[PDB]
Design a protein around this nucleic acid. Structure first.
Ligand SMILES: [K+]
Ligand SMILES: [K+]
Ligand SMILES: [K+]
Ligand SMILES: [K+]
Ligand SMILES: [K+]
Ligand SMILES: [K+]
Lengths: 108, 125, 55, 74, 133, 161
RNA sequence: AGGUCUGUGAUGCCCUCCGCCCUGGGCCGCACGCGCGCUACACUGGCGGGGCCAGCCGGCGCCCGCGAGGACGCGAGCCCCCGCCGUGGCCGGGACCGCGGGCUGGAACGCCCCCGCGCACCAGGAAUGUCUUGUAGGCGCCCGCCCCCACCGCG
RNA sequence: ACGGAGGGGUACACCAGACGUGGAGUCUGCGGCUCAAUCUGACCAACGCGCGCACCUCACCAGGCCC
């Protein structure tokens, strides 16, 4: 199956096998202080989100369930560091692109 | 049909052995590629089709539960024999934790401090 | 010149605060003070064998 | 078909009640707890009382009278 | 070929150093504005600071002189909805001080608690000063 | 430092061998030396716990020793942690011989302190210091901080009798 | 003769008829000396994309909106992997301040988010505290008071 | 009861180590200052202690209804 090959190869070699403009002037979340740098990153994020959907064959994943999948910290704040979520518009839109039930969406 | 369990701190590993999978990711593809060796130690120091489901705690505990499960799941292969009696001996002469689960668990926190032994500083002035 | 010698028994803790341990090191029965943990059948490398431990 | 929910705080009474209903015939335990300074005012070593209270479900999806036991059917 | 100096906006720059960060040598600019200005101005962001051609500085100065006129969004510009012109300016220069000081001028005219705390050179933001500085 | 405290037989491949060693008394005598080392590596509150990263150093430093000397990466280790280990001490200060178990122990700590201080605020890697430091306390040269202070402790003990 | 009549229909004895309520403010004011703590002072690190694991028990789909945050409905961080910066108060450190956008609320002076502004700080004198296994320490999560809000305390 | 009296014990109190605190900014409490009021307690065993102060909680301040 797809599981028999590693994910760090799948995401990259599938972004190499695949497109909004808000891609520009966007960070992946309120955690990350900078926007990403490798401008292939939207293909890479899309390949990651699909490699993460095809895992979940029966039940329905969701988009908040996906921003919560892509999270990191907030720092430079003098306080004990807390975990924050990512953006929602980006992942919802990537799901809509890759889409062309009871809740969310699913594979095939 | 063979049942086997494995434990580290709160990690529970379930093994169905029949005449190799860990969380659907095969042996040498389990995330900690450095500790992969630690996992694969019994297989090489000592196949069948085994299958594992493990959760709980953290990465290193997952490793020490799956490894110990596979050890028991091939320890129960032969029965009532001298191999049944000496395999466990080679496992002990590797480490006794390869059979018997490790019984350490965190000690609870007691008020007036951050952990189980650290108090807060005592200032007289 | 190192003078390796071997302990044949522990007499007891010498320092007021615990610390050092009187041992019977060796064709001789020189007695010496030792800082760290020492069992029987262990080895001490001696800078000199000229002096024996008080008491 | 019939639903039975039977609840009580004392493990002995609850176990008795399930034992004396089968004389005729996942919802695990959870606990109600508080911590609170021992003294009335705020003077002295900061010691704490830790109060605790477990109460049980017993589930009877049906196809003795004990005071302190609670029953609902729904 | 590279030079070791791009002396711009009355503030010296060093070069030999990455351009996206080196452009923060200009006051009023952040790494955010550097990143959203260069690749918009069709320049690679990180090769070296001595390899920035003249027409390329020109593409810069034109993306700098009008940010909302090339798609840089409202929320990423600086002097949003000013009290000089009612319009989302781009203070991107070293004439920031005129805005700041004339602001102090207006407050010292209108006599607000915040301006007076700034006059006494203290906290203005509901922050305790019990502590001994 | 002796053949009763340098473990080179009872040891799993990589250092990591979770279990128990400080529970007894002479238990850590059978603790593999290439693990006793990494165990020390995870020192300082800024590295309290990190075991895998400490492992990324021992095996890697073992990638400069053969690339400069040409001798098995471990034979230099045992001999180096044997070269250190102050022989005497100045405990009313009298000179007292040091325990065999203790020298194996103190000397391991000494090599670590060498890199720790000689890696901070340095573009050069921390593992780089462990590298030259461990190959410096091999033949025997002051360049190795360990070899040096060992000499210093003998000077005081011989003078503090 | 620690503390507590300011927690109570516990209360003796004195004094007030200082009872109840309505609006506005203060308890949060500040040269200054103390104590308990939080974030640091970097390369054993910071940044960008990806992988993935807890327990005290616990709701989340459709969307809009850079974000925070709206309208409508139904039942984990460390760490690892790959890259960048290159010993420079640098991309360490994030205080202080200048616009905007939001939430709570009869009411912001309360809290969030976006751009900009980048303080002090180079491991700390004389002194001083705590600890023996899943322990120190590092990482994060949850509950309490709570209109909003944890650097606190119980876990 | 106490002893710079003798004797016998013991604890992370010391030994061997580790992690800290005191030096910077910052949150919080205390003092002292100011104020119409900045309500008040407690000085090892007070001082993130009297369970999160816009209003209420409030005991304090400037005024104003009712019995
Ligand atoms: K108290
Ligand atoms: K160069
Ligand atoms: K009372
Ligand atoms: K009255
Ligand atoms: K207290
Ligand atoms: K009021």
């Amino acid at each position: 199956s797809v599981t028999r090959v590693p994910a760090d190869v799948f995401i990259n070699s599938f972004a190499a096998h695949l497109c909004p403009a808000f891609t520009d002037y966007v960070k992946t979340g309120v955690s990350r202080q900078y926007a990403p740098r490798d401008a292939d990153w939207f293909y890479i994020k899309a390949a990651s989100v699909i490699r993460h959907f095809y895992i979940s064959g029966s039940h329905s994943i969701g988009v908040a369930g996906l921003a919560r999948k892509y999270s990191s910290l907030q720092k430079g704040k003098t306080t004990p560091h807390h975990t924050k979520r990512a953006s929602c518009k980006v992942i919802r839109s990537i799901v809509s692109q890759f889409l062309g039930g009871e809740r969310g969406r699913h594979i095939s | 049909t063979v049942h086997t369990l494995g434990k580290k701190k709160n990690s529970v590993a379930v093994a169905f052995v029949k005449a190799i999978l860990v969380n659907n990711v095969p042996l040498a593809l389990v995330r900690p590629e450095i500790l992969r060796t630690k996992v694969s130690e019994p297989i090489m120091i000592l196949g069948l089709d085994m299958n594992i489901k493990v959760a709980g705690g953290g990465h290193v505990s997952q490793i020490y539960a799956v490894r110990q499960a596979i050890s028991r799941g091939v320890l129960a292969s032969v029965k009532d024999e001298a191999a049944r009696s000496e395999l466990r001996a080679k496992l002990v002469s590797y480490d006794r934790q390869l059979v018997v689960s490790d019984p350490r668990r965190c000690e609870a926190k007691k008020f007036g401090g951050r952990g189980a032994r650290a108090r807060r500083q005592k200032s007289y002035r | 010149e190192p003078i390796n010698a071997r302990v044949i028994e522990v007499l007891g803790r010498t320092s007021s605060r615990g610390g050092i341990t009187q041992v019977k090191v060796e064709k001789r029965q020189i007695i010496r003070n030792v800082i760290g943990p020492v069992r029987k059948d262990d080895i001490l490398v001696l800078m000199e064998s000229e002096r024996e431990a008080r008491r | 078909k019939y639903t039975i929910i039977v609840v009580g705080k004392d493990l002995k009474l609850v176990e008795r009640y399930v034992k004396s209903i089968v004389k005729e015939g996942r919802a695990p335990v959870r606990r109600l707890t508080i911590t609170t300074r021992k003294s009335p005012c705020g003077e002295g070593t900061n010691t704490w009382h830790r109060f605790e209270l477990r109460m049980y479900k017993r589930t009877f999806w049906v196809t003795v009278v004990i005071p302190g036991i609670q029953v609902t059917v729904e | 070929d590279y030079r070791d100096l791009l002396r711009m906006f009355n503030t010296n720059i060093q070069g030999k150093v990455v351009l996206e960060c080196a452009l923060v040598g200009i006051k009023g600019i952040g790494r955010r504005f550097a990143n959203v200005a260069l690749k918009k101005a069709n320049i690679d962001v990180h090769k070296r600071a001595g390899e920035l051609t003249a027409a390329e500085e020109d593409a810069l100065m034109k993306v700098l002189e009008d940010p909302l006129s090339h798609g840089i969004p409202a929320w990423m510009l600086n002097r949003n909805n000013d009290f000089e012109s009612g319009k989302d300016m781009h203070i991107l220069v070293n004439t920031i001080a005129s805005t700041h000081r004339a602001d102090l001028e207006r407050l010292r005219k209108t006599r607000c608690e915040r301006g007076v705390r700034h006059h006494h050179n203290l906290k203005v933001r509901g922050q305790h000063t019990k502590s001994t500085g | 430092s002796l053949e009763a405290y340098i473990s080179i037989d009872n040891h799993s491949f990589v250092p990591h061998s979770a279990g128990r060693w400080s529970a007894k008394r002479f238990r850590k005598a059978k603790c593999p030396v290439v693990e006793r080392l990494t165990n020390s590596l995870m020192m300082h509150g800024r590295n309290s716990g990190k075991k895998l990263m400490a492992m990324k150093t021992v095996g890697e430093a073992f990638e400069l020793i053969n690339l400069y000397t040409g001798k098995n990466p471990v034979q230099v280790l045992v001999d180096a942690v044997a070269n250190s280990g102050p022989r005497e001490d100045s405990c009313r200060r009298q000179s007292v011989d040091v325990s065999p178990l203790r020298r194996v122990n103190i000397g391991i700590y000494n090599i670590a302190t060498g890199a720790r201080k000689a890696a901070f605020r340095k573009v050069r890697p921390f593992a780089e210091c462990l590298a030259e430091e461990i190959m410096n306390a091999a033949a025997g040269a002051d360049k190795s901080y360990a070899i040096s202070q060992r000499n210093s402790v003998e000077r005081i003990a011989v003078s503090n009798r």
